[PDB]
Structures are given as structure tokens and as C-alpha cells.
Design an enzyme around this catalytic site. Structure first.
Site, PDB file in Angstrom:
ATOM      1  N   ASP A 193      -1.433   5.540  -5.323  1.00 40.90           N
ATOM      2  CA  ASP A 193      -1.845   4.657  -4.226  1.00 40.90           C
ATOM      3  C   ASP A 193      -2.123   3.250  -4.754  1.00 40.90           C
ATOM      4  OD1 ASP A 193      -2.827   3.391  -1.991  1.00 40.90           O
ATOM      5  OD2 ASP A 193      -4.550   4.723  -1.748  1.00 40.90           O
ATOM      6  N   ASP A 222       0.835  -1.212   0.000  1.00 43.95           N
ATOM      7  CA  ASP A 222       0.000   0.000   0.000  1.00 43.95           C
ATOM      8  C   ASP A 222       0.869   1.261   0.000  1.00 43.95           C
ATOM      9  OD1 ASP A 222      -2.145   1.762   0.120  1.00 43.95           O
ATOM     10  OD2 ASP A 222      -2.387   1.620   2.278  1.00 43.95           O
TER      11      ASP A 222
END
Ligand SMILES: CCCCNC(=O)[C@@H](NC(=O)[C@H](C)C[C@H](O)[C@@H]1CSC/C=C/CSC[C@H](NC(=O)OC(C)(C)C)C(=O)N[C@@H](C)C(=O)N1)C(C)C
Length: 377
Positions: free
Chosen positions: A220, A35
Site C-alpha cells: 500500500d 494509492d
């Protein structure tokens, strides 16, 4: 030595990409979601209906308790846990072991995903957004400080049941073609970048470029969709609707609710437009663009019936926290998080998306005046 890290990522479509890790002594194996939109390293540490295994601190002789709680909220999902440290390795990464901060997850809400095959999360962004505060050193900072691994990593996320590569400490030139184009990291918290122009099928959206970055734009890997601020989302959807008005779709389709299906092999890719995002470049008044195909923002999903038709969900959604270039944007590009030089690089991936007459692309140079006015303050 990067060949050993090629293909070290797995996942399910829309469920994130994960890498295998071990924590503790003896090593306990866990699959860890990668992440770039967060900065905490955290693992399931208590039973959960969706967890097939979890971190057992009592079985690790190198575990240390930090005697401090932590809560972390995400766009979707949240958890709270207990902070400690332990030894950590990456079997298909560099041949090292580091002592890292680990949050042991004890309670969660809509965080773990039924059947995702991952049990934790590796936040790869900077300490400024770490919880509970920026003094909790993130994993990659720990890795860089304790070993000789260079201060950069790259991600090659491949679409469809999905796989890819996280090259830790370098760039593997067999994973991309053409030139790498670099955009500055505006500020070291998220991987924040500046979008200076948006085109849909070659037509400028003609908005104040500040709107594209309201109130930030980030890269992201832990978010599936391209997420866009309300005003940009509305203009984009209006333009995509108009280009595809040949066919009619439920209004819920454009919200990401309902899915659309066509008889197998008849998806009308040509009526959906390409999207070009122009990013601030490395020299004065210079930008470059990445072009997104509809094969990226129409995400394939399993037919909700007993049919053999191709079904898709609309993978562009509205945001209230700025632009998010999520996994469907990263798929088919090789993305270099060059933390040492405060820049992010993009190139066409070797697992790129195939259209019969169009091709995803990274192209430059372009001239763009007044790019600094595009950042929101
Ligand atoms: C309320 C937000 C508070 C602020 N929090 C943050 O900014 C935190 N960071 C973040 O939230 C990141 C920006 C996002 C982060 O990667 C989190 C990681 S949560 C773990 C993610 C696992 C992979 S499944 C992807 C999922 N797909 C999805 O929902 O698909 C449909 C939309 C089709 C249903 C998705 O997209 N999730 C977004 C929404 C999201 O929550 N991403 C930390 C810095 C603390």
C-alpha cells in the site's frame, strides 16, 4: 519511452506521493496521491481550508454526471462525493487521454492534509474493492482498456522533500540494480501477498506464519508505516526494544506518539536491527526475502524545538486489518505491480538507503516448505 516518467512523483515525508494529472476540457491541473491500497479515483471538487485548487465540473465541457453518490472510508480519513466521468491525462505519463470514473469530493473528514500539495487520490488496486461496488471501473482498468498501455506499472519511491517515479505501462531498468524477485498476487482486490517468514537481525520470530497474514497482507503506497497485526507487532517491538536497550526511549515512542532526537550526525543506527520479510516466490517451495534497514522504519521528522538535532518517529504500528507494507517499506525498492502476470516484483532501487555497514537487499532463492499454509482463510 520511460525516461519522461522518471521523477514524475513528489511529496512531503509522511504525507504521500503524488503525480500530476489533468481532468476535463480545458484541462485542469491537479496533484493526485498515488494509492495502491484503494481503487477509487477522486478529486477535491469544493472549497476546503487545505485545498489550493479543486475540480470545477461546470468548467469542463466533457464532464458527465452519473447521478449517484459515493462514500469511501480509509484507515485514516474518509470522504463522500458525487460520481461522474471526464477526460483524464497524465502530463508526465503516457501520451494518452482516457474517459475515467471520477468521484467529485464534496465532504471529507481528516482526508486532506494541511500542506500536502495534493488535491485528489488515484486508487490503483482492483475493482473488487471499488466503492460503491465493483462495477465502478478503476482508473488503471480504464487506461488499459482504452489505450495500448501494457497492464502493469512500477513505483520507485525515494526517501528524504521526497520524490520518485511511477512508470506506467512498463519497467525502467535504469531505476534498479540486481535481479527482480516476484511474489504472486494472492487475489485481485488489494495487492495481497503472502509473508512466509520474518527475521529480526537474523533471528526467526518463530510464529505460526498465518499470524503474519492475519487477516491479509497488502502492498500500500498510500500508507506511511509498516503496519503489523497485534501479535506480530508485539513480538517485533519486543525484539527491537531488546536490540536497542543500550538506550532508553519514552514508551510513547513505540506507539508512534513521541519522537526521539539525537545530536546531529550521532544517530546510533547500529543498535537498531534489520527486519527481513520473506515472501512466497514463483516456484514450488521457494521464497525470497527483502531486508529493511532502521533508516526506513525510523522516519525523520522536523525538530519540535529550535535545535539542530536529528529527530525520528517510529514508523511501525499496530494493525487490526492485517499486514500493510507501506511507503517506508517500499522506499529504496523498485516495486513492479505486474497485473498482467498476477505478481509483484521487488528489486533494490537506485535510490536505495545508505548504511555504513549494512545494506537493504532483495535476496533469493530460499527454500520454504508449506508456504500455502501461511495464507489466512
Ligand atoms: C476503515 C478502513 C475501511 C477499509 N478501507 C479500505 O481498505 C480502503 N483502503 C485503505 O484504507 C488503504 C488500506 C489505506 C489507504 O492507502 C489510505 C489512503 S488515505 C490518504 C493518504 C495520504 C498519505 S499520508 C499517509 C498516512 N500517514 C500517517 O498517518 O502517518 C502517521 C501514522 C505517522 C501519523 C497514512 O499512513 N495513512 C493511512 C493510515 C491510510 O489511511 N491510507 C479502500 C479499499 C476503501
Amino acid at each position: 519511452s520511460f525516461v519522461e516518467m522518471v521523477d514524475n512523483l513528489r511529496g512531503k515525508s509522511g504525507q504521500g506521493y503524488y503525480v500530476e494529472m489533468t481532468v476535463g476540457s480545458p484541462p485542469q491541473t491537479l496533484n493526485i496521491l498515488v494509492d495502491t491500497g484503494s481503487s477509487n479515483f477522486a478529486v477535491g471538487a469544493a472549497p476546503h481550508p487545505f485545498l489550493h485548487r479543486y475540480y470545477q465540473r461546470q468548467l469542463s465541457s466533457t464532464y458527465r454526471d452519473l447521478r449517484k453518490g459515493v462514500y469511501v472510508p480509509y484507515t485514516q480519513g474518509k470522504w463522500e462525493g458525487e460520481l461522474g466521468t471526464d477526460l483524464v491525462s497524465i502530463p508526465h505519463g503516457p501520451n494518452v487521454t482516457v474517459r475515467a470514473n471520477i468521484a467529485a469530493i464534496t465532504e471529507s473528514d481528516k482526508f486532506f492534509i494541511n500542506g500536502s500539495n495534493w488535491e485528489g487520490i488515484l486508487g490503483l488496486a482492483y475493482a473488487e474493492i471499488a466503492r460503491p461496488d465493483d462495477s465502478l471501473e478503476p482508473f488503471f482498468d480504464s487506461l488499459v482498456k482504452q489505450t495500448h498501455v501494457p497492464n502493469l506499472f512500477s513505483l520507485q519511491l525515494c526517501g528524504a522533500s521526497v520524490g520518485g517515479s511511477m512508470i506506467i505501462g512498463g519497467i525502467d531498468h535504469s531505476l534498479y540494480t540486481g535481479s527482480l524477485w516476484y511474489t504472486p498476487i494472492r487475489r485481485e482486490w488489494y495487492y495481497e501477498v503472502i509473508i512466509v517468514r520474518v527475521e529480526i537481525n537474523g533471528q526467526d520470530l518463530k510464529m505460526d506464519c498465518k499470524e503474519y497474514n492475519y487477516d491479509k497482507s497488502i502492498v500500500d503506497s498510500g500508507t506511511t508505516n509498516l503496519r503489523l497485526p497485534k501479535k506480530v507487532f508485539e513480538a517485533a517491538v519486543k525484539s527491537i526494544k531488546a536490540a536497542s536497550s543500550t538506550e532508553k526511549f519514552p514508551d510513547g515512542f513505540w506507539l508512534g506518539e513521541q519522537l526521539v532526537c539525537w545530536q546531529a550526525g550521532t544517530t546510533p543506527w547500529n543498535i537498531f536491527p534489520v527486519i527481513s520479510l520473506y515472501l512466497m516466490g514463483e516456484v514450488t517451495n521457494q521464497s525470497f526475502r527483502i531486508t529493511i534497514l532502521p533508516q526506513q522504519y525510523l522516519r525523520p521528522v522536523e525538530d519540535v524545538a529550535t535545535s539542530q538535532d536529528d529527530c525520528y518517529k517510529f514508523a511501525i504500528s499496530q494493525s487490526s486489518t492485517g499486514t500493510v507494507m507501506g511507503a517506508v517499506i517500499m522506499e529504496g525498492f523498485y516495486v513492479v505491480f505486474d497485473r498482467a502476470r498476477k505478481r509483484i516484483g521487488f528489486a533494490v532501487s537506485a535510490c536505495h538507503v545508505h548504511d555504513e555497514f549494512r545494506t537493504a537487499a532483495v535476496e533469493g532463492p530460499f527454500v520454504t516448505l508449506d508456504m500455502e499454509d501461511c495464507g489466512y482463510n
